[PDB]
Write a protein that binds this DNA or RNA. Structure first.
Lengths: 150, 150
DNA sequence: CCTATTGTTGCAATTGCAACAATAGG
DNA sequence: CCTATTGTTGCAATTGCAACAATAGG
């Protein structure tokens, strides 16, 4: 069985570090861009749903989202039928940053996917989607506190 | 073209968070285990070379390597020919941790590579190798300070 | 002498395990 | 009432852009 955890970890460290440095121009912090991007596509969704689809810690997302709302990029309004859910909507400062973030994310994507044909990227989109699903259960299994057996 | 950066970010966050909590029992910090894995297999390596292979910040490294030596997990040695380079070697408690660490990583890799035939993982190893190489230039590009033009 | 390497700290922010809250929804 | 959901703070870290120092190797 050949390792894959290493390269995927390397590739993510680079792409995230590039995005952090480039987005510091737009005053976005270390990991704050992954939230607003997802919040802009799915308007009004909840911390717990983002925590699930993004696979980050809940407390880490809580304070990181507190700044995006403090610094005026998103707004957390509540629903009349739910006293606990906080529906996270983007502001006009956030709606204008989304087309720019898509360009850095897409240009970094084109640099990373340089050399692949249209069929090769789909074979890689499917392979990564499968790996993302295979690891989803064990992430919450360890996140809850349960001990793995190996 | 389709997007690949998003899934790669999710997979690397989950695999890292799983490894962090499970290596917390072995008194390794938030991201310290990635260094010791490489130092054990590359004895006499320098901190700068690790920064290049792992694609993490140089300041993030140096501060983290300090704890690795401060907590007796590795050792910083000086050479005769070079008063600038610090050849990094693991301690004895560092060597005994290596077969355990590549046992959790090995199993996390098997969970991630679930349902792939032996050929499908090679088509994935070779694919991720290019993506790692394709992004190698642009990361040091931005890290050094030069602005990127789309 | 000169420039790229190799390596460290000053703030200042993020990160995340506990540990604790409070509603949802039976 | 009960339990899963959803959420925030306490606090001790790591993390990272500046701003530095110091030898390597011409």
């Amino acid at each position: 069985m050949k390792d894959i955890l290493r390269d995927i970890g390397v590739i993510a460290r680079a792409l995230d570090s590039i995005s952090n440095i480039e987005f510091k121009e737009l005053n976005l912090a270390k990991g704050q861009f992954i939230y607003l991007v997802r919040i802009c596509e799915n308007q009004g969704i909840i911390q717990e749903k983002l925590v699930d689809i993004l696979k980050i810690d809940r407390t880490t997302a809580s304070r990181a989202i507190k700044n995006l709302e403090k610094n005026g990029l998103i707004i957390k309004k509540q629903n009349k039928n739910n006293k606990k859910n906080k529906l996270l909507f983007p502001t006009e400062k956030g709606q204008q940053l989304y087309p720019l973030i898509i360009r850095e994310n897409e240009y970094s994507n084109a640099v990373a996917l340089k050399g692949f044909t249209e069929a090769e990227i789909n074979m890689l989109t499917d392979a990564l989607k499968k790996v993302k699903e295979n690891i989803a259960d064990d992430w919450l299994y360890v996140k809850k506190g349960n001990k793995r057996s190996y």
